Design a binder for this molecule. Structure first.
Ligand SMILES: *[C@@H]1O[C@H](CO[C@@H]2O[C@@H](C)[C@@H](O)[C@@H](O)[C@@H]2O)[C@@H](O[C@@H]2O[C@H](CO)[C@@H](O)[C@H](O)[C@H]2NC(C)=O)[C@H](O)[C@H]1NC(C)=O
Ligand SMILES: *[C@@H]1O[C@H](CO[C@@H]2O[C@@H](C)[C@@H](O)[C@@H](O)[C@@H]2O)[C@@H](O[C@@H]2O[C@H](CO)[C@@H](O)[C@H](O)[C@H]2NC(C)=O)[C@H](O)[C@H]1NC(C)=O
Ligand SMILES: CCCC[N+](C)(C)[C@@H](Cc1c[nH]c2ccccc12)C(=O)NCCC1CCCCCC1
Ligand SMILES: *[C@@H]1O[C@H](CO[C@@H]2O[C@@H](C)[C@@H](O)[C@@H](O)[C@@H]2O)[C@@H](O)[C@H](O)[C@H]1NC(C)=O
Ligand SMILES: *[C@@H]1O[C@H](CO)[C@@H](O)[C@H](O)[C@H]1NC(C)=O
Ligand SMILES: *[C@@H]1O[C@H](CO)[C@@H](O)[C@H](O)[C@H]1NC(C)=O
Ligand SMILES: *[C@@H]1O[C@H](CO)[C@@H](O)[C@H](O)[C@H]1NC(C)=O
Length: 526
């Protein structure tokens, strides 16, 4: 119940899971707290300690703005931080099976939240079910989000950019140096993440600094080529300056803009983060990854195109209704509390909200490609069309393009299409299989019959957990024992993908082909 790590001993706690035991080490520090002079800088290595560190509760989550569009609504607030916000937030968690394993594959979770929100302590990121059921070690870490983790003065070490990614990376190296002491295999490490977490995984595939720190990768509903996932260097500087003016920290000396920003209280920086862009969207990522020249040596789309990335297996997928969640965060005529039937002119107003700096021709072209109904007076035509627009553009098509280009360099890739809507999903039914709601199935929450899930959901989560574990351990996401449909590799010509649902799991081909040709080839030109 105590483990000797390279910086000192840590005490865990035992947990009862499915008539068995999991040992949890919650809140192990992995860097110097980035306070004072250290704010905005790369994480600094941790100094030794002589005590026994009590790792028996989740640590502080990183400073971040909270979603307030639905106070008291579980569908919204299940994603909000469940620990104190603090700048002192660079901690990580470890779930090891009991008895202590000998050479367990390690699954490392990177949460999403648009690079502005999120925390490893969320209920749906609870790794004990994976450790219990599959004998893997689950690691998850908190990394800085928002401007505190991604403010960029390119080249300037006082705020070089990508600090949150380097937090992630320092946690990956912690697993390299220490996880063997917990019974894990540092040579069998699988990164997996969702949305901005998945985009982070994809950038670890491109970052040479991370190539020795993991084996395989799983990308759930996200990838770096998504329009929200990388900030340009023009955007980053225009945004760092706008933050400076709004905080009164404008200086000619660029580094003393940073020291001025470093004496502002965390809340003042959080308050101004939303205004650094003239017109935001429910998908704005005002402070995200940048081509810093350190974690990212070049524009990542070039690295992908020219095969500059860690050669290994990837598992990639999206959900059926990625876009709908964002519609009730700004689009007119929409509400989680009615069926959100919108008109043609509401749809058109919706495009202006999601594509504010887009020529009127571009917005007409989106409308044209999405509004030739197979039946022209289905009243929900425009409602579904806007969701599919936001989903295809922001998640599904970038994930498919990532998988194609990555697979074109010889590595096995597996693509899934998650299309099960959770029986307990607090959001309305018109929103469907929403962004983020495969996670609980991946983490095995339906395996606990105590908690309101159908038996079909238990079976689906059991299979997904097995597939994810086999992918991490073996590089092949098959369920070999229960006569399951085999999951074929995704190759650039046939582009087979596996659908994940409770009734029938099927092999299909060329997901959203005609929609993605619009977004991937034509729309980048407008
Ligand atoms: C780049 O930054 C300028 C400055 O943004 C303004 O000031 C910030 C502190 C913040 O409050 C923003 O919301 C402000 O708009 C942007 O220039 C502004 O652009 C808007 C719309 O184009 C215009 O109404 C303002 O008058 C402009 N203000 C100034 C001083 O020029 C600019 O749009 C930003 N983006 C780009 C791509 O250049
Ligand atoms: C669905 O609801 C939206 C949102 O309206 C809010 O939520 C409702 C459940 C109800 O409590 C309203 O009083 C709230 O204001 C409706 O959008 C509004 O529609 C009216 C009339 O069309 C308009 O005056 C408001 O500006 C709209 N609000 C917006 C666009 O944000 C929508 O009409 C409802 N649709 C259906 C089919 O019920
Ligand atoms: C207009 C309000 C802006 C909201 N802001 C920019 C903070 C984003 C920040 C953001 C969060 N997740 C992202 C993914 C991509 C790009 C940006 C974001 C956001 O809270 N949206 C809500 C979507 C999520 C919550 C609803 C429940 C299901 C999960 C989806
Ligand atoms: C660290 O924890 C030590 C062990 O205490 C254990 O955890 C607490 C919550 C009780 O349940 C106790 O019975 C357990 O054995 C403490 O003795 C020690 O004081 C703690 N140190 C710090 C700095 O918190
Ligand atoms: C764990 O497995 C690796 C190969 O994947 C091996 O090199 C290492 O020695 C093993 N460690 C054990 C069994 O403790
Ligand atoms: C001001 O800028 C110069 C470079 O132009 C830099 O060397 C110096 O350190 C800055 N001032 C302070 C107090 O750091
Ligand atoms: C396979 O089926 C058995 C029942 O025969 C069930 O107990 C087990 O959980 C299933 N495993 C997976 C990975 O689906």
């Amino acid at each position: 119940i105590i483990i000797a790590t390279k910086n000192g001993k840590v005490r865990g706690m035992q947990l009862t899971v499915f008539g068995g035991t999991v040992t949890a080490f919650l809140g192990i520090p992995y860097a110097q707290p980035p306070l004072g002079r250290l704010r905005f800088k790369k994480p600094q290595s941790l100094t030794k300690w002589s005590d026994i560190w009590n790792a028996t509760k989740y640590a502080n989550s990183c400073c971040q703005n909270i979603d307030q569009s639905f106070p008291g609504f579980h569908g919204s607030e299940m994603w909000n931080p469940n620990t104190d916000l603090s700048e002192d937030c660079l901690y990580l968690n470890v779930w090891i099976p009991a008895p202590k394993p000998k050479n367990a594959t390690v699954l490392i979770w990177i949460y999403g939240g648009g690079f502005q929100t999120g925390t490893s302590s969320l209920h749906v990121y609870d790794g004990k079910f994976l450790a219990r059921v599959e004998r893997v070690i689950v690691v998850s870490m908190n990394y800085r989000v928002g401007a505190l983790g991604f403010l960029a003065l390119p080249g300037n070490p006082e705020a070089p950019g990508n600090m949150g990614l380097f937090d992630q990376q320092l946690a990956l190296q912690w697993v390299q140096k220490n996880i063997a002491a917990f019974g894990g295999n540092p040579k069998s490490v699988t990164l997996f993440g969702e949305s901005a977490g998945a985009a982070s995984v994809s950038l670890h595939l491109l970052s040479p600094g991370s190539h020795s720190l993991f084996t395989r990768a799983i990308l759930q509903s996200g990838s770096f080529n998504a329009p929200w996932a990388v900030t340009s260097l023009y955007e980053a500087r225009n945004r760092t300056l706008n933050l400076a003016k709004l905080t009164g920290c404008s200086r000619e000396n660029e580094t003393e803009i940073i020291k001025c920003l470093r004496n502002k209280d965390p809340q003042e920086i959080l308050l101004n983060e939303a205004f650094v862009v003239p017109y935001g969207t429910p998908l704005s990522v005002n402070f995200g990854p940048t081509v810093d020249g350190d974690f990212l040596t070049d524009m990542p789309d070039i690295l992908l195109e020219l095969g500059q990335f860690k050669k290994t297996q990837i598992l990639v997928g999206v959900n059926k209704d990625e876009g709908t969640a964002f519609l009730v965060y700004g689009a007119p005529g929409f509400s989680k509390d009615n069926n959100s039937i919108i008109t043609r002119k509401e749809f058109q107003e919706g495009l202006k909200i999601f594509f504010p700096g887009v020529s009127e021709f571009g917005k007409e072209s989106i409308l044209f490609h999405y509004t030739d109904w197979v039946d022209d007076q289905r009243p929900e035509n425009y409602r579904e069309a806007l969701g599919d627009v936001v989903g295809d553009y922001n998640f599904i098509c970038p994930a498919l393009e990532f998988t194609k280009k990555f697979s074109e360099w010889g590595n096995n890739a597996f693509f899934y299409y998650f299309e099960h809507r959770s029986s307990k999903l607090p959001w309305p039914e018109w929103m469907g299989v929403m962004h983020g709601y495969e996670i609980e199935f991946v983490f095995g929450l339906p395996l606990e019959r105590r908690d309101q899930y159908t038996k079909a959901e238990e079976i689906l989560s059991r299979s997904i957990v097995k597939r994810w574990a086999n992918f991490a351990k073996y590089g092949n996401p098959q369920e070999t024992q229960n006569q399951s449909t085999s999951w074929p590799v995704f190759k650039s010509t046939e582009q087979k993908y596996l659908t994940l649902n409770t009734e029938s799991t099927r092999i299909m081909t060329k997901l959203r082909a005609q929609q993605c040709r619009f977004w991937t080839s034509f729309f980048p030109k407008v």
